[PDB]
Design a protein around this ligand. Structure first.
Ligand SMILES: NC(=O)c1ccc[n+]([C@@H]2O[C@H](COP(=O)([O-])OP(=O)(O)OC[C@H]3O[C@@H](n4cnc5c(N)ncnc54)[C@H](O)[C@@H]3O)[C@@H](O)[C@H]2O)c1
Ligand SMILES: NC(=O)c1ccc[n+]([C@@H]2O[C@H](COP(=O)([O-])OP(=O)(O)OC[C@H]3O[C@@H](n4cnc5c(N)ncnc54)[C@H](O)[C@@H]3O)[C@@H](O)[C@H]2O)c1
Lengths: 255, 253, 255, 253
């Protein structure tokens, strides 16, 4: 499928990023992983698919470090064919009490990192006349929730940026799109559930409690589901999908 | 991959519906075809994929014929697992000059027939614990164009219907979603190209595309069938009530 | 404000239509009322504002009757300067059990009547090079709810039709826009509340119960609020508002 | 009508912000002006309406200066009842050539300063049981254009922020909404017209409008001030978290 391609997935040492990375690896792509932690387990999870991988620990709020991450991709793989901008971080507080440092960090990681990844990957994509930029946004790139000022702003910004990049690259074989997930089973969400079960509560009940307000299906989107969508967007059938923001959300945005 | 599944694609005797049907057959689904013209060519295109196909000639203007369509699917194949509501027509005129019969016919086929297909297919999908309803809407379900009063109304209606059905089925293994294409080179678009050329036909074709579709490239029926196939996969399981555009950048600006 | 103008408001013998009619009358517009009932009270409610009014009982699911309604407006007032398409009707059922006659009626009144009103009013608006068409749609022209297949389809159709008409009239002084209300205090909603109070329950509690699911403000939009918005759209400041769908919804669509 | 109310309009020394400030003053609000250039002309435009005005020169890039802006409003007038987050800048370049300092400056002013204004104004609005926060976003908060990476991102951010704040304040008499203009003839747009003309300047002006805005007519600052005035009325009381476009048809297609 993607034999001969290289994908860079940000925040891919765990959760959504890792799930997407795994699907792409199985499809035959070499992977540039990024994220916190010993990367030996993550690299091994990719390499066991019979593909090459490297990792860079870049903190994507630091532009110098994002530059280092792309310089590594250029050195080891000759540049990125497929960039997955996957991100960071959340903080909940009413707008008037929303911490200034948390606003700045959420903007830096969830929004500005996407611009920097994009400006760094796009020249090589154009030069090779083939490329895919996939921005993992959120239902919160299309609607708001209480307590999430910075995250909703940042994710809406990503949806907007995606449109501009989709338009700028429209006459080329490079596309840029966004996927907007609802509730996803991440290690953090799984921890919330496990913490309920450790107290003695029922894990499925904990899930239904978490999802009831916003997600009609009461069922999680999985990293595997998102990886499969990324894989679709990288296919020939994705060639005229441009500047789109496709929601995978168990009905969140339908109401 | 769709082996063991039955797909019904309305208006599959040409253009997009035929493209979608081909991809689903290639995936292993048995197919119920529908639409006007000689069905033999469409039947041969599907069955080359080593799958069974039948054509039913229902005029989807007529609710009784839609019912006969679904009853045949039930007797032939034991019911519809994947329903693609594709059949559609176009008429271009300013709203105050828009023929009343065209408004009624476009609403009846491009909107009401989607509701009729959906209502007929959903009970068996529920009862068998799995289903996919995919509505072929348009960029015109999300935005307007001049001269397209009935079509844009109907297509917006389809996008709204899709949300209701997606919500209603959210606690089941049935999903309902819309695909919103930009320009695809079919007889429907050719007529618009010709009416513009009435003049170099290829210049008319380019101008028609360039006005709306930044990629300056048409979407293909095969691309759209591959998306239907994706929405039929397990990865589509929590895509519900969505309207996903494949449009060369039409809606991004 | 609108001295010298004529407004036709469909479904204006009560509720939202009447509220809009009243605001326009106070602004100085003559009114063409339409709807069920003895119209003497409704006409008198308009005429006491020092404006002229007429009424036609047209059932807007019957195209011949819609024609009669506009023929009356042409005869008595020389045509409509301001058309408010305000509508009909609701029915709740799962899609697979949604009655065929109810689908057809809801489409006819909530959607097709808008096309017919529009085709009948627009020639005279262009001829006079001034006009306003305002379609009272719904939050359900932008999102779905369970049990409302026909109404959501019809209201989405109205939002689409509004865009086409806004574009077709863009180079002229005629505009066409939609207002998309959330929960509105109508006589029917007031009846639901009164029925609760007659049993002994608290009226404000009944309101909070009705609104809690969908409308964060827990407060109604009123016909007066909607009339004031119509009035704004008819002002010079509305001259470049074209094909818009403006929501007044206590936060419904923000989430 | 706004008699007894205090409005703060960021970036009100020219263009849209000055237009909005004028209409609010005419309505009877006392005004806190802000923005670069000689403030005397703007002060004279507002005070001709028989209202008090002060100008504070805060560079909204700088959060400490935003705080001093709001503290002055508090000492001068007892706080801000109507906040219009208007100040904004533009820079056009392809994304991969987009200056890093321009990305940061556009995000800081066109998005983060809206959050800072909002956070500073909301407590007093809540405490006094009434308020209006109106964000001047753009059609570019809803769609993209080529070369406008930072601006479109920021404006989409503003439209999202607006929804959160509208929800959060929904059980109060404070509303927060966005107005999304299409093209308005200001210095910001003039620069784009000039860069296109670099060539008849009036042809450049028309072409710039016609590409995006079907009405072939600019929106005026006065029109936008009249909308702010409407959103400040009782009829605006349940308009919450909305993004209302005034755009000559830009978003309808
Ligand atoms: N072609 C495009 O650019 C484009 C873009 C977006 C959406 N669409 C939509 O795609 C769908 C298919 O359109 P297309 O371009 O392939 O057009 P097409 O004319 O090539 O095919 C239409 C099909 O529908 C059938 N049909 C027409 N009326 C019917 C009726 N009453 N009952 C049963 N079948 C009927 C025709 O026989 C044919 O099989 C339509 O819903 C159209 O609105 C088309
Ligand atoms: N003009 C348009 O077509 C258009 C369309 C949609 C939205 N907008 C938005 O309208 C708003 C006003 O733009 P405009 O067209 O009137 O532009 P303008 O350049 O004429 O006015 C901008 C104002 O903001 C001020 N300003 C700039 N930087 C500032 C800073 N750091 N701190 C404080 N004030 C600052 C300027 O001094 C001026 O008062 C912007 O947010 C813009 O994005 C403009």
């Amino acid at each position: 499928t993607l034999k001969g391609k290289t994908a860079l997935v940000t925040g891919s040492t765990s959760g959504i990023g890792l799930g997407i990375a795994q699907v792409l690896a199985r499809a035959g792509a070499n992977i540039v992983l990024n994220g916190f932690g010993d990367p030996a387990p993550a690299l091994a999870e990719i390499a066991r698919h019979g593909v090459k991988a490297v990792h860079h620990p870049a903190d994507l709020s630091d532009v110098a470090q994002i530059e280092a991450l792309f310089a590594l991709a250029e050195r080891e793989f000759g540049g990125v064919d497929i960039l997955v901008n996957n991100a960071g971080i959340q903080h909940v507080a009413p707008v008037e009490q929303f911490p200034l440092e948390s606003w700045d960090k959420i903007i830096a990681l969830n929004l500005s990192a996407v611009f920097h990844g994009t400006r760094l990957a796009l020249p090589g994509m154009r030069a090779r006349n083939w490329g895919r930029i996939i921005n993992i946004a959120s239902v919160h790139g299309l609607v708001g929730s209480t307590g999430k000022a910075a995250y909703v702003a940042a994710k809406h910004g990503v949806v907007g940026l995606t449109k501009v990049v989709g338009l700028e690259t429209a006459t080329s074989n490079v596309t840029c799109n966004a996927i907007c997930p609802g509730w996803v089973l991440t290690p953090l969400v799984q921890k919330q559930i496990d913490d309920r079960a450790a107290n003695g509560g029922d894990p499925l009940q904990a899930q239904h409690d978490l999802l009831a307000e916003k997600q009609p299906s009461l069922a999680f989107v999985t990293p595997e589901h998102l990886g499969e969508l990324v894989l679709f967007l990288c296919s020939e059938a994705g060639s005229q999908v441009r500047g789109a923001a496709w929601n995978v959300d168990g009905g969140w945005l339908a109401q």
